[PDB]
Point group: D2
Chain length 120, copies 4
Protein backbone atom coordinates (compact mmCIF):
# COMPACT_ATOMS: atom_id res chain seq x y z
CA UNK A 1 0.00 0.00 0.00
CA UNK A 2 3.07 2.21 0.26
CA UNK A 3 6.14 2.55 -1.95
CA UNK A 4 9.49 3.38 -0.32
CA UNK A 5 10.79 5.83 -2.91
CA UNK A 6 9.04 9.16 -3.56
CA UNK A 7 10.19 12.65 -4.69
CA UNK A 8 8.73 16.04 -3.84
CA UNK A 9 9.97 19.32 -5.38
CA UNK A 10 9.31 22.94 -4.58
CA UNK A 11 10.07 26.19 -6.36
CA UNK A 12 11.20 28.90 -3.93
CA UNK A 13 10.88 31.60 -6.57
CA UNK A 14 7.11 31.49 -7.13
CA UNK A 15 5.96 29.72 -3.92
CA UNK A 16 5.03 26.67 -5.93
CA UNK A 17 5.64 22.93 -5.95
CA UNK A 18 7.73 22.51 -9.10
CA UNK A 19 5.75 20.44 -11.56
CA UNK A 20 7.10 18.13 -14.27
CA UNK A 21 10.73 18.23 -13.17
CA UNK A 22 12.25 15.13 -14.76
CA UNK A 23 13.35 12.45 -12.27
CA UNK A 24 15.79 9.58 -13.16
CA UNK A 25 16.62 6.90 -10.54
CA UNK A 26 19.95 4.98 -11.16
CA UNK A 27 20.90 1.78 -9.28
CA UNK A 28 24.52 0.63 -8.70
CA UNK A 29 25.32 -2.75 -10.24
CA UNK A 30 27.54 -5.56 -9.02
CA UNK A 31 30.51 -4.52 -11.21
CA UNK A 32 30.16 -0.97 -9.89
CA UNK A 33 28.27 0.72 -12.73
CA UNK A 34 24.74 2.21 -12.90
CA UNK A 35 21.59 0.85 -14.53
CA UNK A 36 18.19 2.59 -14.85
CA UNK A 37 15.87 1.87 -11.93
CA UNK A 38 12.90 4.14 -12.52
CA UNK A 39 11.94 7.31 -14.39
CA UNK A 40 9.12 9.88 -14.27
CA UNK A 41 7.88 13.50 -14.41
CA UNK A 42 7.03 15.39 -11.21
CA UNK A 43 3.23 15.59 -10.98
CA UNK A 44 1.21 18.79 -10.70
CA UNK A 45 1.67 19.08 -6.93
CA UNK A 46 5.36 18.52 -6.51
CA UNK A 47 5.11 14.87 -5.60
CA UNK A 48 6.20 11.87 -7.68
CA UNK A 49 5.18 8.56 -6.13
CA UNK A 50 4.59 5.02 -7.33
CA UNK A 51 8.15 5.26 -8.59
CA UNK A 52 9.37 1.78 -7.60
CA UNK A 53 7.59 -1.32 -6.33
CA UNK A 54 7.84 -1.98 -2.58
CA UNK A 55 9.74 -5.14 -3.64
CA UNK A 56 11.79 -4.03 -6.64
CA UNK A 57 13.26 -1.37 -4.41
CA UNK A 58 15.78 -3.70 -2.78
CA UNK A 59 19.05 -2.96 -0.94
CA UNK A 60 21.63 -0.83 -2.73
CA UNK A 61 23.28 2.45 -3.74
CA UNK A 62 21.01 4.94 -5.55
CA UNK A 63 21.18 8.20 -7.40
CA UNK A 64 18.16 10.41 -8.01
CA UNK A 65 18.76 12.97 -10.76
CA UNK A 66 16.24 15.84 -11.06
CA UNK A 67 16.72 17.67 -14.36
CA UNK A 68 16.52 21.06 -12.71
CA UNK A 69 18.00 22.99 -15.70
CA UNK A 70 15.36 22.38 -18.34
CA UNK A 71 12.79 23.32 -15.69
CA UNK A 72 14.30 26.77 -15.20
CA UNK A 73 15.29 27.07 -18.87
CA UNK A 74 11.58 26.75 -19.62
CA UNK A 75 10.71 30.02 -17.83
CA UNK A 76 13.41 32.35 -19.18
CA UNK A 77 15.99 31.52 -16.53
CA UNK A 78 19.46 30.19 -17.31
CA UNK A 79 20.31 28.01 -14.21
CA UNK A 80 23.64 27.45 -12.49
CA UNK A 81 23.53 23.69 -11.93
CA UNK A 82 23.38 21.41 -14.99
CA UNK A 83 21.10 19.24 -12.88
CA UNK A 84 20.74 18.11 -9.30
CA UNK A 85 21.51 14.54 -8.12
CA UNK A 86 21.11 12.65 -4.83
CA UNK A 87 23.21 9.57 -4.01
CA UNK A 88 22.21 7.50 -0.98
CA UNK A 89 22.21 3.84 -0.13
CA UNK A 90 18.71 2.62 0.56
CA UNK A 91 18.78 -0.61 2.51
CA UNK A 92 16.90 -3.57 3.92
CA UNK A 93 18.69 -2.38 7.11
CA UNK A 94 15.37 -0.91 8.18
CA UNK A 95 13.84 2.58 7.85
CA UNK A 96 12.31 1.07 4.72
CA UNK A 97 10.61 4.19 3.18
CA UNK A 98 12.13 7.35 1.66
CA UNK A 99 10.98 10.74 0.33
CA UNK A 100 13.46 13.08 -1.36
CA UNK A 101 12.68 16.82 -1.27
CA UNK A 102 13.94 19.69 -3.38
CA UNK A 103 13.93 23.45 -2.75
CA UNK A 104 14.87 24.64 -6.20
CA UNK A 105 16.18 28.13 -6.98
CA UNK A 106 18.27 29.42 -9.99
CA UNK A 107 21.61 29.29 -8.16
CA UNK A 108 20.81 27.11 -5.16
CA UNK A 109 19.16 23.83 -4.08
CA UNK A 110 18.60 22.18 -0.72
CA UNK A 111 17.93 18.42 -0.66
CA UNK A 112 16.11 16.76 2.21
CA UNK A 113 16.07 13.16 3.20
CA UNK A 114 13.19 11.83 5.29
CA UNK A 115 13.34 8.15 6.16
CA UNK A 116 10.62 6.29 8.01
CA UNK A 117 9.88 2.95 9.53
CA UNK A 118 6.52 1.18 9.00
CA UNK A 119 4.98 -1.14 11.59
CA UNK A 120 7.06 -4.30 11.58
Amino acid sequence: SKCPLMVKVLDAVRGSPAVDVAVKVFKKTADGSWEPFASGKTAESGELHGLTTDEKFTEGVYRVELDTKSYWKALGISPFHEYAEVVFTANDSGHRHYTIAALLSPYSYSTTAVVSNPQN
Copy 2:
Protein backbone atom coordinates in the same frame (compact mmCIF):
# COMPACT_ATOMS: atom_id res chain seq x y z
CA SER B 1 41.39 39.66 14.34
CA LYS B 2 37.75 39.35 13.14
CA CYS B 3 34.46 41.28 13.50
CA PRO B 4 32.56 40.37 16.75
CA LEU B 5 29.40 40.37 14.66
CA MET B 6 28.81 40.29 10.93
CA VAL B 7 26.07 39.66 8.35
CA LYS B 8 26.26 38.39 4.80
CA VAL B 9 23.38 37.86 2.37
CA LEU B 10 23.07 35.98 -0.97
CA ASP B 11 20.79 36.03 -4.04
CA ALA B 12 19.69 32.45 -4.95
CA VAL B 13 18.12 33.95 -8.12
CA ARG B 14 21.08 35.87 -9.65
CA GLY B 15 23.73 33.78 -8.00
CA SER B 16 25.20 36.83 -6.30
CA PRO B 17 25.64 39.17 -3.25
CA ALA B 18 22.47 40.89 -1.91
CA VAL B 19 23.54 44.49 -2.26
CA ASP B 20 22.35 47.41 -0.23
CA VAL B 21 20.15 45.57 2.23
CA ALA B 22 18.99 47.51 5.28
CA VAL B 23 19.95 45.64 8.45
CA LYS B 24 18.63 46.84 11.78
CA VAL B 25 19.84 45.35 15.08
CA PHE B 26 17.88 45.49 18.30
CA LYS B 27 18.75 44.43 21.86
CA LYS B 28 16.18 43.24 24.38
CA THR B 29 16.07 45.44 27.49
CA ALA B 30 15.55 43.20 30.52
CA ASP B 31 11.81 43.94 30.77
CA GLY B 32 10.73 42.95 27.26
CA SER B 33 11.84 46.03 25.27
CA TRP B 34 13.90 45.93 22.07
CA GLU B 35 16.27 48.91 21.89
CA PRO B 36 18.28 49.98 18.84
CA PHE B 37 21.75 48.47 18.89
CA ALA B 38 23.11 49.23 15.37
CA SER B 39 22.19 49.22 11.70
CA GLY B 40 23.66 49.45 8.24
CA LYS B 41 23.57 48.32 4.62
CA THR B 42 25.15 45.36 2.89
CA ALA B 43 27.98 46.55 0.62
CA GLU B 44 28.68 45.17 -2.89
CA SER B 45 30.32 41.98 -1.63
CA GLY B 46 27.02 41.23 0.12
CA GLU B 47 28.65 41.67 3.55
CA LEU B 48 28.12 44.34 6.24
CA HIS B 49 31.10 45.17 8.41
CA GLY B 50 31.24 47.14 11.62
CA LEU B 51 27.94 46.54 13.42
CA THR B 52 29.55 46.66 16.90
CA THR B 53 32.78 46.04 18.85
CA ASP B 54 33.25 43.73 21.83
CA GLU B 55 32.92 46.52 24.35
CA LYS B 56 29.38 47.28 23.08
CA PHE B 57 28.35 43.75 21.98
CA THR B 58 27.21 42.30 25.33
CA GLU B 59 25.78 39.18 26.92
CA GLY B 60 22.07 39.22 26.17
CA VAL B 61 19.53 38.35 23.48
CA TYR B 62 19.65 40.29 20.20
CA ARG B 63 17.70 40.52 16.96
CA VAL B 64 18.98 41.02 13.40
CA GLU B 65 16.35 42.31 11.01
CA LEU B 66 17.22 42.19 7.27
CA ASP B 67 14.49 43.86 5.21
CA THR B 68 14.03 41.28 2.56
CA LYS B 69 10.88 42.97 1.16
CA SER B 70 12.33 46.38 0.16
CA TYR B 71 15.02 44.38 -1.65
CA TRP B 72 13.11 42.15 -4.07
CA LYS B 73 10.50 44.91 -4.37
CA ALA B 74 13.12 47.22 -5.84
CA LEU B 75 13.57 44.65 -8.63
CA GLY B 76 9.90 44.10 -9.49
CA ILE B 77 9.24 40.91 -7.49
CA SER B 78 6.54 40.99 -4.76
CA PRO B 79 8.07 38.72 -2.06
CA PHE B 80 6.27 36.63 0.50
CA HIS B 81 8.11 37.74 3.64
CA GLU B 82 7.74 41.26 5.06
CA TYR B 83 11.27 40.98 6.39
CA ALA B 84 13.62 38.43 7.94
CA GLU B 85 14.98 37.96 11.43
CA VAL B 86 17.42 36.09 13.54
CA VAL B 87 16.83 36.15 17.26
CA PHE B 88 19.62 34.78 19.43
CA THR B 89 21.56 35.16 22.66
CA ALA B 90 25.14 36.29 22.49
CA ASN B 91 28.16 36.37 24.79
CA ASP B 92 26.37 34.22 27.44
CA SER B 93 28.48 31.07 27.09
CA GLY B 94 31.46 33.38 26.58
CA HIS B 95 32.22 36.36 24.34
CA ARG B 96 32.32 34.98 20.80
CA HIS B 97 32.45 36.32 17.22
CA TYR B 98 29.29 35.59 15.26
CA THR B 99 28.38 35.59 11.60
CA ILE B 100 24.81 35.45 10.44
CA ALA B 101 24.63 34.42 6.77
CA ALA B 102 21.35 34.53 4.82
CA LEU B 103 20.23 33.03 1.51
CA LEU B 104 17.34 34.91 -0.09
CA SER B 105 14.60 33.87 -2.52
CA PRO B 106 11.21 35.60 -3.15
CA TYR B 107 9.27 32.90 -1.26
CA SER B 108 12.07 31.22 0.74
CA TYR B 109 15.14 31.98 2.90
CA SER B 110 17.83 30.49 5.11
CA THR B 111 20.02 31.74 7.91
CA THR B 112 23.01 29.97 9.39
CA ALA B 113 25.39 30.93 12.15
CA VAL B 114 29.08 30.43 12.59
CA VAL B 115 30.17 30.87 16.19
CA SER B 116 33.87 31.59 16.42
CA ASN B 117 36.02 32.27 19.41
CA PRO B 118 38.25 35.28 18.73
CA GLN B 119 41.93 34.72 17.99
CA ASN B 120 42.37 33.73 21.66
Copy 3:
Protein backbone atom coordinates in the same frame (compact mmCIF):
# COMPACT_ATOMS: atom_id res chain seq x y z
CA SER C 1 -6.81 20.53 1.22
CA LYS C 2 -9.79 21.82 3.20
CA CYS C 3 -7.33 23.88 5.31
CA PRO C 4 -6.12 27.45 4.51
CA LEU C 5 -2.98 27.57 6.63
CA MET C 6 -0.79 24.56 7.45
CA VAL C 7 2.74 24.32 8.85
CA LYS C 8 5.11 21.45 8.21
CA VAL C 9 8.34 21.36 10.24
CA LEU C 10 11.23 18.87 9.61
CA ASP C 11 14.28 17.84 11.63
CA ALA C 12 17.56 17.70 9.59
CA VAL C 13 19.55 15.99 12.33
CA ARG C 14 17.14 13.05 12.83
CA GLY C 15 15.90 12.65 9.25
CA SER C 16 12.26 12.55 10.43
CA PRO C 17 9.67 15.35 10.82
CA ALA C 18 10.03 17.61 13.82
CA VAL C 19 7.36 16.26 16.14
CA ASP C 20 5.82 18.33 18.95
CA VAL C 21 7.27 21.74 17.96
CA ALA C 22 4.92 24.38 19.44
CA VAL C 23 3.57 26.87 16.91
CA LYS C 24 1.97 30.19 17.85
CA VAL C 25 0.16 32.15 15.14
CA PHE C 26 -0.59 35.81 15.78
CA LYS C 27 -2.61 38.25 13.73
CA LYS C 28 -1.76 41.92 13.66
CA THR C 29 -4.83 43.86 14.81
CA ALA C 30 -5.86 47.24 13.44
CA ASP C 31 -4.15 49.12 16.29
CA GLY C 32 -0.84 47.66 15.07
CA SER C 33 -0.29 45.02 17.78
CA TRP C 34 -0.30 41.21 17.65
CA GLU C 35 -3.56 39.65 18.79
CA PRO C 36 -3.39 35.81 19.31
CA PHE C 37 -4.59 33.88 16.21
CA ALA C 38 -4.02 30.09 16.24
CA SER C 39 -1.71 27.97 18.37
CA GLY C 40 -0.74 24.32 18.32
CA LYS C 41 2.32 22.05 18.21
CA THR C 42 3.34 19.71 15.41
CA ALA C 43 1.42 16.45 15.21
CA GLU C 44 3.54 13.34 14.65
CA SER C 45 3.66 13.98 10.87
CA GLY C 46 5.40 17.24 11.62
CA GLU C 47 2.37 19.19 10.33
CA LEU C 48 -0.66 21.22 11.45
CA HIS C 49 -4.13 21.47 9.82
CA GLY C 50 -6.97 22.72 12.03
CA LEU C 51 -5.10 25.94 12.88
CA THR C 52 -8.00 27.93 11.42
CA THR C 53 -11.17 27.66 9.33
CA ASP C 54 -11.51 28.81 5.72
CA GLU C 55 -13.52 31.82 7.01
CA LYS C 56 -11.46 33.03 9.99
CA PHE C 57 -8.30 33.43 7.93
CA THR C 58 -9.11 36.97 6.74
CA GLU C 59 -6.93 39.25 4.59
CA GLY C 60 -4.11 40.63 6.72
CA VAL C 61 -0.51 40.21 7.78
CA TYR C 62 0.20 37.33 10.10
CA ARG C 63 3.07 36.11 12.23
CA VAL C 64 3.79 32.40 12.62
CA GLU C 65 6.40 31.56 15.27
CA LEU C 66 7.91 28.18 16.04
CA ASP C 67 9.63 27.34 19.27
CA THR C 68 12.80 25.74 17.90
CA LYS C 69 14.59 26.73 21.11
CA SER C 70 12.66 24.25 23.22
CA TYR C 71 12.57 21.64 20.46
CA TRP C 72 16.28 21.35 20.22
CA LYS C 73 16.69 21.88 23.94
CA ALA C 74 14.59 18.79 24.79
CA LEU C 75 17.03 16.66 22.82
CA GLY C 76 20.04 18.21 24.57
CA ILE C 77 21.26 20.48 21.81
CA SER C 78 21.69 24.17 22.63
CA PRO C 79 20.50 25.76 19.38
CA PHE C 80 21.61 29.21 18.22
CA HIS C 81 18.21 30.84 17.57
CA GLU C 82 15.79 31.98 20.22
CA TYR C 83 12.89 30.96 17.98
CA ALA C 84 11.76 31.03 14.33
CA GLU C 85 9.45 33.79 13.05
CA VAL C 86 7.73 34.11 9.67
CA VAL C 87 5.56 37.20 9.26
CA PHE C 88 3.73 37.15 5.90
CA THR C 89 0.75 38.98 4.41
CA ALA C 90 -2.12 36.61 3.71
CA ASN C 91 -3.79 38.95 1.26
CA ASP C 92 -6.39 36.37 0.41
CA SER C 93 -6.39 37.05 -3.30
CA GLY C 94 -5.32 34.62 -6.02
CA HIS C 95 -4.47 31.98 -3.48
CA ARG C 96 -6.40 30.88 -0.41
CA HIS C 97 -4.24 28.01 0.84
CA TYR C 98 -0.83 28.62 2.39
CA THR C 99 1.79 26.17 3.49
CA ILE C 100 4.66 27.41 5.63
CA ALA C 101 7.42 24.80 5.64
CA ALA C 102 10.66 24.85 7.65
CA LEU C 103 13.78 22.68 8.00
CA LEU C 104 15.42 22.76 11.42
CA SER C 105 19.06 22.33 12.41
CA PRO C 106 20.70 23.48 15.69
CA TYR C 107 22.45 26.47 13.99
CA SER C 108 20.44 26.93 10.76
CA TYR C 109 16.84 27.05 9.52
CA SER C 110 15.08 27.43 6.18
CA THR C 111 11.50 28.57 5.62
CA THR C 112 9.58 28.50 2.40
CA ALA C 113 6.05 29.23 1.45
CA VAL C 114 3.87 27.37 -0.97
CA VAL C 115 0.69 29.15 -1.90
CA SER C 116 -1.61 26.97 -3.99
CA ASN C 117 -5.21 28.02 -4.70
CA PRO C 118 -8.84 26.77 -4.67
CA GLN C 119 -8.28 25.35 -8.16
CA ASN C 120 -11.81 24.54 -9.43
Copy 4:
Protein backbone atom coordinates in the same frame (compact mmCIF):
# COMPACT_ATOMS: atom_id res chain seq x y z
CA SER D 1 39.15 34.58 -4.21
CA LYS D 2 41.43 35.74 -7.06
CA CYS D 3 41.62 32.20 -8.53
CA PRO D 4 38.77 30.41 -10.39
CA LEU D 5 37.15 27.64 -8.28
CA MET D 6 36.80 28.38 -4.53
CA VAL D 7 34.73 26.10 -2.33
CA LYS D 8 33.23 26.88 1.12
CA VAL D 9 31.69 24.19 3.40
CA LEU D 10 29.92 25.12 6.72
CA ASP D 11 28.13 22.94 9.36
CA ALA D 12 24.42 23.35 10.32
CA VAL D 13 24.79 21.20 13.47
CA ARG D 14 27.97 22.72 14.95
CA GLY D 15 27.82 26.20 13.42
CA SER D 16 31.44 26.06 12.50
CA PRO D 17 33.46 25.67 9.27
CA ALA D 18 33.74 22.07 8.11
CA VAL D 19 37.40 21.08 8.04
CA ASP D 20 38.98 18.14 6.23
CA VAL D 21 36.09 17.68 3.86
CA ALA D 22 37.83 15.97 0.94
CA VAL D 23 36.93 17.61 -2.33
CA LYS D 24 37.37 16.24 -5.84
CA VAL D 25 36.55 18.18 -9.02
CA PHE D 26 36.07 16.33 -12.30
CA LYS D 27 35.76 17.63 -15.87
CA LYS D 28 33.59 16.27 -18.69
CA THR D 29 35.40 14.91 -21.70
CA ALA D 30 35.32 15.27 -25.47
CA ASP D 31 33.90 11.74 -25.30
CA GLY D 32 31.38 12.88 -22.69
CA SER D 33 33.64 10.94 -20.32
CA TRP D 34 34.91 12.49 -17.09
CA GLU D 35 38.55 13.56 -16.85
CA PRO D 36 40.08 14.14 -13.34
CA PHE D 37 40.45 17.90 -12.65
CA ALA D 38 41.13 18.50 -8.95
CA SER D 39 41.70 17.32 -5.39
CA GLY D 40 42.05 18.94 -2.01
CA LYS D 41 40.44 19.27 1.41
CA THR D 42 38.78 22.10 3.32
CA ALA D 43 41.06 24.01 5.70
CA GLU D 44 40.11 25.20 9.20
CA SER D 45 38.23 27.93 7.40
CA GLY D 46 36.00 25.22 5.92
CA GLU D 47 37.10 26.78 2.68
CA LEU D 48 39.27 25.26 -0.07
CA HIS D 49 41.41 27.77 -1.92
CA GLY D 50 44.07 25.92 -3.90
CA LEU D 51 42.76 24.25 -7.05
CA THR D 52 42.82 25.81 -10.51
CA THR D 53 44.13 28.84 -12.36
CA ASP D 54 42.28 31.08 -14.81
CA GLU D 55 44.81 29.85 -17.36
CA LYS D 56 43.77 26.22 -16.71
CA PHE D 57 40.06 26.54 -15.89
CA THR D 58 38.57 26.20 -19.42
CA GLU D 59 34.95 26.19 -20.57
CA GLY D 60 33.16 23.00 -19.58
CA VAL D 61 30.95 20.83 -17.39
CA TYR D 62 32.29 20.13 -13.92
CA ARG D 63 31.28 17.94 -11.00
CA VAL D 64 32.60 18.90 -7.58
CA GLU D 65 32.25 15.99 -5.20
CA LEU D 66 32.11 16.54 -1.46
CA ASP D 67 32.74 13.43 0.63
CA THR D 68 30.00 14.09 3.16
CA LYS D 69 29.77 10.50 4.36
CA SER D 70 33.29 10.46 5.74
CA TYR D 71 32.64 13.82 7.42
CA TRP D 72 29.57 12.75 9.37
CA LYS D 73 31.11 9.36 10.01
CA ALA D 74 34.27 10.53 11.81
CA LEU D 75 32.08 12.47 14.28
CA GLY D 76 29.88 9.46 15.10
CA ILE D 77 26.82 10.85 13.31
CA SER D 78 25.33 8.46 10.72
CA PRO D 79 24.43 10.37 7.49
CA PHE D 80 22.14 9.59 4.58
CA HIS D 81 23.84 11.12 1.56
CA GLU D 82 27.01 9.42 0.30
CA TYR D 83 28.44 12.45 -1.47
CA ALA D 84 27.22 15.92 -2.35
CA GLU D 85 27.85 16.84 -5.97
CA VAL D 86 27.76 20.21 -7.64
CA VAL D 87 27.54 19.68 -11.39
CA PHE D 88 27.66 22.95 -13.38
CA THR D 89 28.89 24.07 -16.79
CA ALA D 90 31.54 26.81 -16.54
CA ASN D 91 33.00 29.80 -18.33
CA ASP D 92 30.50 29.80 -21.20
CA SER D 93 30.71 33.62 -21.10
CA GLY D 94 34.44 34.30 -20.88
CA HIS D 95 35.76 32.75 -17.65
CA ARG D 96 34.52 34.36 -14.43
CA HIS D 97 34.95 33.66 -10.71
CA TYR D 98 33.12 30.80 -9.07
CA THR D 99 32.23 30.10 -5.48
CA ILE D 100 30.45 27.02 -4.25
CA ALA D 101 29.14 26.79 -0.69
CA ALA D 102 27.77 23.76 1.08
CA LEU D 103 25.83 23.76 4.30
CA LEU D 104 26.10 20.36 5.98
CA SER D 105 23.73 18.27 8.07
CA PRO D 106 23.24 14.46 8.20
CA TYR D 107 19.98 14.22 6.28
CA SER D 108 20.03 17.31 4.10
CA TYR D 109 22.63 19.46 2.44
CA SER D 110 22.27 22.71 0.46
CA THR D 111 24.43 24.12 -2.31
CA THR D 112 24.56 27.51 -4.02
CA ALA D 113 26.97 29.36 -6.30
CA VAL D 114 27.89 33.07 -6.44
CA VAL D 115 29.08 34.03 -9.92
CA SER D 116 31.60 36.86 -9.60
CA ASN D 117 33.52 39.04 -12.03
CA PRO D 118 37.21 39.98 -11.57
CA GLN D 119 36.78 42.69 -14.22
CA ASN D 120 33.31 44.34 -14.19
